[PDB]
PDB file of C-alpha atoms in Angstrom:
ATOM      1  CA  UNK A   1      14.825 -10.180 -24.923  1.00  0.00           C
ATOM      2  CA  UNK A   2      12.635 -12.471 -23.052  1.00  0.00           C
ATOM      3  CA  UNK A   3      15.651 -15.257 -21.176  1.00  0.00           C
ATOM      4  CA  UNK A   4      14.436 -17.046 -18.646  1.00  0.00           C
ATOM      5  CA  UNK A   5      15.711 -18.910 -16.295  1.00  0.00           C
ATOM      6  CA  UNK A   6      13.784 -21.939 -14.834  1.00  0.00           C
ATOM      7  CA  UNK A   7      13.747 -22.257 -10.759  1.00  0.00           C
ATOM      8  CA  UNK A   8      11.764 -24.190  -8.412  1.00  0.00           C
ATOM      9  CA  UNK A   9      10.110 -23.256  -5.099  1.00  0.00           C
ATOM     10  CA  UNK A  10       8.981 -25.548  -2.380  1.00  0.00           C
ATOM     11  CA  UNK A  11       5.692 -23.837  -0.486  1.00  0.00           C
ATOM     12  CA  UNK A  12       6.322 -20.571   1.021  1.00  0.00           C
ATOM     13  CA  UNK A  13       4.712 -19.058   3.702  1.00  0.00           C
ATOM     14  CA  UNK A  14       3.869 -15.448   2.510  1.00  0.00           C
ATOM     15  CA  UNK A  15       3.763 -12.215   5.157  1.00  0.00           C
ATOM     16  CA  UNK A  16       2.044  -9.007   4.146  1.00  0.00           C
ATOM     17  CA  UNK A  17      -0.541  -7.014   3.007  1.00  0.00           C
ATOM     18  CA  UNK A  18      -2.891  -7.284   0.137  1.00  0.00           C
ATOM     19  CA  UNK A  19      -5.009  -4.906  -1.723  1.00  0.00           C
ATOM     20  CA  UNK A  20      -7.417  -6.082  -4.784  1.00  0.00           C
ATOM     21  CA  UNK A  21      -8.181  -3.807  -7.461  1.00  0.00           C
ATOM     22  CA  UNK A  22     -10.989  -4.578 -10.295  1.00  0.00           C
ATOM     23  CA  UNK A  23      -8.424  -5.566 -13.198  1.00  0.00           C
ATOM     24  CA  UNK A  24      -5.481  -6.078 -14.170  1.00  0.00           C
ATOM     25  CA  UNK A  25      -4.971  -2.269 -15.692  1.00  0.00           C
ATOM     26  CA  UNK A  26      -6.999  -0.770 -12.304  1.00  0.00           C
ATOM     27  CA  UNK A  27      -4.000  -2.397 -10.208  1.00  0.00           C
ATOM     28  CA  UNK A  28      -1.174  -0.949 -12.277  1.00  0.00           C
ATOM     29  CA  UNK A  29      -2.627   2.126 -11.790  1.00  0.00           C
ATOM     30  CA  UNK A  30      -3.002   1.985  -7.871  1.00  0.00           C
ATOM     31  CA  UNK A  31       0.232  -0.313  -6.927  1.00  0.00           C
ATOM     32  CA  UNK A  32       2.839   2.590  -7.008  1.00  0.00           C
ATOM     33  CA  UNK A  33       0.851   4.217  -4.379  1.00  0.00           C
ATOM     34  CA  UNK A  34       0.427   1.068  -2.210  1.00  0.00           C
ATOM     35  CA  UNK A  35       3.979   0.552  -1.868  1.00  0.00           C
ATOM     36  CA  UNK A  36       4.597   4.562  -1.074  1.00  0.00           C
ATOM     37  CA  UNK A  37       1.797   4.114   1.302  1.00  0.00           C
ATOM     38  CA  UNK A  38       3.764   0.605   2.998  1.00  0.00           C
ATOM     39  CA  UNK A  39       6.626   2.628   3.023  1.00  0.00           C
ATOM     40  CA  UNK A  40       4.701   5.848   4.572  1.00  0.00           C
ATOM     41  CA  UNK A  41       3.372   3.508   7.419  1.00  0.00           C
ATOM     42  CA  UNK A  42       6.270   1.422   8.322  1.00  0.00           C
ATOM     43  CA  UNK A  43       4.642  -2.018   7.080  1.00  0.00           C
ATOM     44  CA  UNK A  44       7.376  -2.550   4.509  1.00  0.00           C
ATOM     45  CA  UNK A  45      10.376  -1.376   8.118  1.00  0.00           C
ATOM     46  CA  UNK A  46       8.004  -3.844   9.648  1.00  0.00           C
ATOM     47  CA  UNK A  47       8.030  -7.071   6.780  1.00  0.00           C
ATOM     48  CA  UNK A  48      11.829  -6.860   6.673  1.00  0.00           C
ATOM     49  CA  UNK A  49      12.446  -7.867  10.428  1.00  0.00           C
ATOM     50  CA  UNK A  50       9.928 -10.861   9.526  1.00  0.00           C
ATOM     51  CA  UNK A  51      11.957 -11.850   6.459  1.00  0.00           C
ATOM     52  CA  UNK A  52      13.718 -15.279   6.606  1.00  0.00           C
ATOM     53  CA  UNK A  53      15.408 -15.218   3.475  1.00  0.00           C
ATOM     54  CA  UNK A  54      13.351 -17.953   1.799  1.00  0.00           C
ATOM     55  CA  UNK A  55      13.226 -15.955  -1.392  1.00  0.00           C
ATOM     56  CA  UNK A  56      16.237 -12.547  -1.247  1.00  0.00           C
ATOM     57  CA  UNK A  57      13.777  -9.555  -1.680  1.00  0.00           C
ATOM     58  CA  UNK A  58      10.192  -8.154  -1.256  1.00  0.00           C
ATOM     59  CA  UNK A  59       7.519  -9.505  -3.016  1.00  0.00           C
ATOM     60  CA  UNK A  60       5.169  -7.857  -5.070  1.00  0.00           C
ATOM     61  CA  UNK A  61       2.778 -10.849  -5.421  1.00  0.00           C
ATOM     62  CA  UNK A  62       0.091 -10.840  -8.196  1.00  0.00           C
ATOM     63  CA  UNK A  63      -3.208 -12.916  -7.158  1.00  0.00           C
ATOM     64  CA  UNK A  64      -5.547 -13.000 -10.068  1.00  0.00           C
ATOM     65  CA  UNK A  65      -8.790 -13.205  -8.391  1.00  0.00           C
ATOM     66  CA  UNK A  66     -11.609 -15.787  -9.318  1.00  0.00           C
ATOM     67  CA  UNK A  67     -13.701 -13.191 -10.745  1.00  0.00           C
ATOM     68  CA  UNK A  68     -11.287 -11.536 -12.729  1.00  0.00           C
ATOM     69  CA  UNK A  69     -10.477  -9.190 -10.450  1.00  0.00           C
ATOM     70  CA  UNK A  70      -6.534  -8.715  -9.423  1.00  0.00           C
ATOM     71  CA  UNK A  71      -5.100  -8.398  -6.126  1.00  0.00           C
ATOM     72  CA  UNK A  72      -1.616  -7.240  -5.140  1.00  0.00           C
ATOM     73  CA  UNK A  73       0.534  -8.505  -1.946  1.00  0.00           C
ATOM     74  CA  UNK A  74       3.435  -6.670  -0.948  1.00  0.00           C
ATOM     75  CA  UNK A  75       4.878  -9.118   1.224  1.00  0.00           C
ATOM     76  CA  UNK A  76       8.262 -11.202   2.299  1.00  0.00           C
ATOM     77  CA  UNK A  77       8.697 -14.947   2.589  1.00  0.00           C
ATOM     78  CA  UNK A  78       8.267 -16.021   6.448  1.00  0.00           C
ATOM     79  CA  UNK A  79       7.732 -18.351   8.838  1.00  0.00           C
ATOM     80  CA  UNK A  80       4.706 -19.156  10.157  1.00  0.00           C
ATOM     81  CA  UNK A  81       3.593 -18.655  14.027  1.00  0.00           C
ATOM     82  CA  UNK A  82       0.397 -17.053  15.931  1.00  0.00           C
ATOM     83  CA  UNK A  83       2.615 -13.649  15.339  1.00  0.00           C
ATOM     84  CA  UNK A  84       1.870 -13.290  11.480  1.00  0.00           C
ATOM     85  CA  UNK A  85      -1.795 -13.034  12.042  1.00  0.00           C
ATOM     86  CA  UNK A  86      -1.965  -9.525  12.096  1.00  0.00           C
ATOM     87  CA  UNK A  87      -1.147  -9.549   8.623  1.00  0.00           C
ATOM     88  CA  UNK A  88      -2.264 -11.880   5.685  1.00  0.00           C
ATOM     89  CA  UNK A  89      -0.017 -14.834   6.169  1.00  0.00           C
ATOM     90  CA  UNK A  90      -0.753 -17.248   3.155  1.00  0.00           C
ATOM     91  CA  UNK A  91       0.817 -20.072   1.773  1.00  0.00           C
ATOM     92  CA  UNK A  92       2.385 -19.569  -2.080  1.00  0.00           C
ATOM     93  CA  UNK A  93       2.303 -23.289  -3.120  1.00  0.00           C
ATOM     94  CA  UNK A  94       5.309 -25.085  -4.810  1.00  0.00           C
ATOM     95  CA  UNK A  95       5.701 -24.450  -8.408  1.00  0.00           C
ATOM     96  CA  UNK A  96       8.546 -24.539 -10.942  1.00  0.00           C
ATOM     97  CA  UNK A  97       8.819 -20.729 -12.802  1.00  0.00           C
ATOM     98  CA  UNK A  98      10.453 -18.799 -15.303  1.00  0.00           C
ATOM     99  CA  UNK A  99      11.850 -15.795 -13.984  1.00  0.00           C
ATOM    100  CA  UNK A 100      12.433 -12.842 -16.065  1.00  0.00           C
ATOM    101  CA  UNK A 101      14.479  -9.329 -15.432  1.00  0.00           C
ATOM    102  CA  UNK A 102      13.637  -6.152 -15.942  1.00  0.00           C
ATOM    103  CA  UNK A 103      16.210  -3.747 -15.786  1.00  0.00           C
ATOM    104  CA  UNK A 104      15.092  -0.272 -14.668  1.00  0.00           C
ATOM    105  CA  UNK A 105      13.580   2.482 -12.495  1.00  0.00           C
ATOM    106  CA  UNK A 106      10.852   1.172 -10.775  1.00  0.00           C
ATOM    107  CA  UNK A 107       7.917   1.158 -11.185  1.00  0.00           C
ATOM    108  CA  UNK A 108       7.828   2.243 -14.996  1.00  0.00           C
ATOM    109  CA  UNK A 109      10.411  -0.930 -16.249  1.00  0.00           C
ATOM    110  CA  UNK A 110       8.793  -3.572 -14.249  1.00  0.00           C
ATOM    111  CA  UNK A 111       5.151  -3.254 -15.847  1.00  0.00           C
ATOM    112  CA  UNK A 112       6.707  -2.596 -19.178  1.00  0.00           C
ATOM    113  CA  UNK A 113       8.599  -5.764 -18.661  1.00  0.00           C
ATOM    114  CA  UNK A 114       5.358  -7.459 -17.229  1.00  0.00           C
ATOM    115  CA  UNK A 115       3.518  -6.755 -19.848  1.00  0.00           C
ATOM    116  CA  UNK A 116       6.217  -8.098 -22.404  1.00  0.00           C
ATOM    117  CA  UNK A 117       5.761 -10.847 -19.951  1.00  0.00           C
ATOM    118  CA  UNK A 118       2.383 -11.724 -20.389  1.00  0.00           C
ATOM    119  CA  UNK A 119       2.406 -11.168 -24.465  1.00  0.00           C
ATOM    120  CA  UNK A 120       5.433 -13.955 -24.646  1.00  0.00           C
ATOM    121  CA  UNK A 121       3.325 -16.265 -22.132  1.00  0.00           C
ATOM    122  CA  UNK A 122      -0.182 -16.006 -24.781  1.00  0.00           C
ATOM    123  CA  UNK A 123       2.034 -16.650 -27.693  1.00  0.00           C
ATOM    124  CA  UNK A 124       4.658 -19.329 -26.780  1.00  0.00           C
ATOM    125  CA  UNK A 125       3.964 -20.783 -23.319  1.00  0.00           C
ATOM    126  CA  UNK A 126      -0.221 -21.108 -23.887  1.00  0.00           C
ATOM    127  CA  UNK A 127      -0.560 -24.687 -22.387  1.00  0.00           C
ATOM    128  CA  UNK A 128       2.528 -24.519 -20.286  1.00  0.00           C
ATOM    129  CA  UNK A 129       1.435 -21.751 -17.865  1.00  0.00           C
ATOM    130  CA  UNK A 130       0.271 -21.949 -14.345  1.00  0.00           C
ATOM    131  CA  UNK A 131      -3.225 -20.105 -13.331  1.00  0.00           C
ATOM    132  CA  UNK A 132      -1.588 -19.368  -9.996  1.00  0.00           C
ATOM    133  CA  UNK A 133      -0.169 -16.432  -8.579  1.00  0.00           C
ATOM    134  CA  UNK A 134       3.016 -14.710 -10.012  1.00  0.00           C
ATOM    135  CA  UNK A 135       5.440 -11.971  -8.390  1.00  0.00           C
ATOM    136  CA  UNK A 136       7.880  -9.056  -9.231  1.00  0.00           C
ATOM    137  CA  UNK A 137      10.592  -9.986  -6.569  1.00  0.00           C
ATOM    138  CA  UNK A 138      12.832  -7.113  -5.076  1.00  0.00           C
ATOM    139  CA  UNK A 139      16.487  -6.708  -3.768  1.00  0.00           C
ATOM    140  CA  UNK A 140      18.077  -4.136  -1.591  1.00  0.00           C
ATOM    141  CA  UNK A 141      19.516  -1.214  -3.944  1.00  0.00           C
ATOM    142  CA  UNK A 142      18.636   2.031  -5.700  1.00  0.00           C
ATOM    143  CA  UNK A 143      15.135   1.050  -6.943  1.00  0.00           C
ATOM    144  CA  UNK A 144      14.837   4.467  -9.177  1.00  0.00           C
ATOM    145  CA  UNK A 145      17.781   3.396 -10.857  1.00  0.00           C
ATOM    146  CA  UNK A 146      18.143   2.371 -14.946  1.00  0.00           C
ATOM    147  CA  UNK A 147      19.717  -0.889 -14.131  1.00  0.00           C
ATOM    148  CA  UNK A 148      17.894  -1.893 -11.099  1.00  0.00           C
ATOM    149  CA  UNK A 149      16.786  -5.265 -11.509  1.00  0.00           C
ATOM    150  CA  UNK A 150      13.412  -7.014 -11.060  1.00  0.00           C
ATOM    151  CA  UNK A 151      12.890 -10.454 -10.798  1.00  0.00           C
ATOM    152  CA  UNK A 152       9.753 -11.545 -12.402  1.00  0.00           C
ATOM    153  CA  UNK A 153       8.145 -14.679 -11.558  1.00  0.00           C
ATOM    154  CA  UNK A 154       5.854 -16.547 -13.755  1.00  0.00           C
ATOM    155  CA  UNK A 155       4.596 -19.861 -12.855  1.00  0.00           C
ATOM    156  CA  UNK A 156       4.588 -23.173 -15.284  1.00  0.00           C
ATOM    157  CA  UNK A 157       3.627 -26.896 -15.329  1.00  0.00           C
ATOM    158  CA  UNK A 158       6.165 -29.418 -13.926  1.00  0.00           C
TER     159      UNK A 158
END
């Protein structure tokens, strides 16, 4: 079903890398390959060591852009220093959220849940949504699993 629970974040300081894709179906498409391609390179080896727990798990950030493009950040919540420059190192501003699961192999469950996600947000939470960025949030484990579990993150009001 679509539970939620409802959790608060104070501003984060985000650490990674970000790729923007023309749409929102154009990203799907292309963020398998940008984690396997993190993974290939040692940036995701890299994030972890820069990790400071703020949030338990890699982020898979969704920025919709201004002009309707989408952009994804793979990144991990950090602190901030001259260090992080090398990569994007943004700020995620406070904001209360409903966080979803989705229970399965990655990355097939998480945009099925997502896009569950979305249709439960343009019927029942129309004027209570956030235009601000949302993420899939990811803990240690066996990711290619059935009953791995993604957090989803959808900002509200409040």
């Amino acid at each position: 079903g679509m539970e939620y629970q409802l959790q608060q974040l104070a501003s984060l300081t985000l650490v990674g890398i970000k790729e923007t894709y023309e749409n929102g179906r154009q990203a799907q498409q292309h963020i398998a390959g940008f984690w396997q391609r993190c993974y290939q390179e040692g940036v995701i080896a890299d994030l972890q060591l820069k990790n400071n727990g703020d949030l338990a798990g890699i982020l898979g950030l969704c920025i919709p852009e201004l002009d309707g493009k989408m952009s994804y950040m793979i990144a991990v919540t950090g602190d901030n220093s001259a260090d992080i420059a090398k990569y994007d190192v943004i700020t995620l501003a406070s904001s209360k959220y409903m966080v979803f699961e989705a229970q399965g192999a990655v990355p097939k469950a998480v945009q099925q849940k997502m896009e569950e996600v979305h249709h439960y947000i343009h019927q029942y939470q129309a004027n209570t949504v956030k235009s601000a960025p949302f993420f899939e949030l990811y803990q240690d484990g066996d990711t290619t699993s059935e009953k791995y579990i993604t957090e989803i993150w959808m900002p509200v009001k409040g």
